[PDB]
Amino acid sequence: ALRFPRFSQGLAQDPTTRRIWFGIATAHDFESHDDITEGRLYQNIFASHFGQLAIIFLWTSGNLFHVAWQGNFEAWVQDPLHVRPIAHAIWDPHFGQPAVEAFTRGGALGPVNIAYSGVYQWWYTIGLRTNEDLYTGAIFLLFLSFISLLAGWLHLQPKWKPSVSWFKNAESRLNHHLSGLFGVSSLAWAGHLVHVAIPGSRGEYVRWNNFLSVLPHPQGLGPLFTGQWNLYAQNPDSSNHLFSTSQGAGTAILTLLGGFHPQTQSLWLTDMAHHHLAIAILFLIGGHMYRTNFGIGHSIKYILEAHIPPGGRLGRGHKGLYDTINNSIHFQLGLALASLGVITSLVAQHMYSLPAYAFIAQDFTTQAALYTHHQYIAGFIMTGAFAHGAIFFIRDYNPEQNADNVLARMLEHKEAIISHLSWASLFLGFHTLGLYVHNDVMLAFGTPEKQILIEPIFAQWIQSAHGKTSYGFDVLLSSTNSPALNAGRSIWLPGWLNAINENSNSLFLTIGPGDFLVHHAIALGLHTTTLILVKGALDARGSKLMPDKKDFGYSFPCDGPGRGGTCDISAWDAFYLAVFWMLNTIGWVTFYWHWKHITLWQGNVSQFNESSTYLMGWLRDYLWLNSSQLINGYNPFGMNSLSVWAWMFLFGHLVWATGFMFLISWRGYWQELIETLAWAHERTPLANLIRWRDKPVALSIVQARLVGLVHFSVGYIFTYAAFLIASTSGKFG
């Protein structure tokens, strides 16, 4: 070891500046550290998990503290639709007087930032009312952060550090995570809804002091144990109801209404309590599936061994997969990241269409910001999932132990897979681009009637299937004689059909040809990003150009200029390439969402409907048109609150462009340049009194790919964030 990094002797012995850089970028890749064992691996991961949890608690505690101490929460609760919430105060000694003036808003004593995270609506909806409640929350979370640090520290000392056999007890961890972590947590949350949030929705302030005196339901507990639960659904809130008040207040604690609260435009609190209760029961009963210490349950290994189709079209089926996955933390991280990315996009798609927080659907900057936020998170999570699929194939995959099972057969016919992803991406690309360009030429030559506008009739037919009447397809739920309509008429269908056919909300928005085209661009991006990542993972162990690639690791510069040239041939390079395509795809997704909504919120839906079918329409009527207030956030005539978004807007443009350097210039140029600079320093009087301890060298090949991708991404995100927030909030509508 002998110096930083202490976990890598090969890096500490590096005399160049590289030693520092690679010490940072490799600090968490435990499997590559000197003297690593499996036990040390698992224990370091476990403790790192406690450290992460502590960070998360400390972060939420900070948000709570700042809203309570510098925010509008109490004032915001009284007028949700006319108070801009406050994130925190601004103390910047670089402000001129105009910035102090222009940023002082939200009814505060100095400059503040308006929050666009939507925590006011959430905390208001769940029952928090006073800054005092928020302080109790923040101190509780600071406490939880501390106990996270405590447990992580604890399980690193012997007799408290678990064996790897314990980490590999999968059945027990699944039983406790399904039944306890998922189920019991959800059940308790239903508790908070019926004891606190619903009372606060009906005017009752229930806290820790009085929550034992108050009943959640007048008859409660007794109809539950009798088995007559409908008494809890009996008296719901009135369709005329004021959310902080007892006007229209019911007594029901568990309903299945199906629509929105007419005032708050969000889901019914009784609906949500019922939801978490029901899925909590499903998780509880489902968490008893696997075998532990009591002589009942499943052997996941035995189930996997059993699922081998006769006739042998899947060969040996799923045999050996239990050890293949349980022994590979990268396989596990890949499955976790894939699933988590899917449900992250799912959260994004369901929180704009079915808002669950009071008075959040009217805050348009928040809905846009949250949708964008979660879609980019979901994208990065997906790319990472495939990255760890590849790392699995290199580091952990044992060909003989997976012989002729489904997993090995993935590798065995990888050229059919990759080639068909290539075909789908080429078809989608050729034709989506072709139709856009055709429409642009038609509008250039002044003949819009010559466009190719394809009705998205399949999705329209699905919306009709949901009971939307805009297209008159008369199918189930859209038709009177449908058994599906009869079966739910008495339950959720009145509220649901009411909500879907309201024209103000974002519940199954009306779609036309412009939506067809962008949906096929999105298909293109999913298919191309997926093609890059899948080819990267399946060629990680080798190709015809580099058959021994598995011997070189996940990340290496290349294999030299021989055999034709081999730059960007590693799997890590495939990830690096795919991130660009992900940023493109989520760029299309978020451009789509934000333009459709910003036209909806203005009552000018037609502008999207007519202008989204040719690309000049996107360039002129979306980006160019909505940059107007943003780019004037400061100018020769003064400033306003949008200046921080104007500045940031350029900041991104700068960072992005800086990335291009690291991506276009490659290393040797800079290495020779730095040699001339070393000569310069040694031959300059007074300065040569000063000597570097680390030999200055140009950044590594891979290191430059990473640094340039990071600048590209930071500039990407910050640019679009500045434009999104300035263009929406500037109008607030």
């Binding site: 070891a1 002998l2 110096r3 930083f4 520092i20 010490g23 105060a89 103390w91 000694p93 680390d694």
Partner: peptide
Amino acid sequence: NLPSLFVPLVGLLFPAVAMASLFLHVEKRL
């Protein structure tokens, strides 16, 4: 008043101390 203490604390003093300390740890020789 408190921001006038903690903004320079974490924006000037803390980065100077952390950068100097990390510089020393990173340049050390055992």
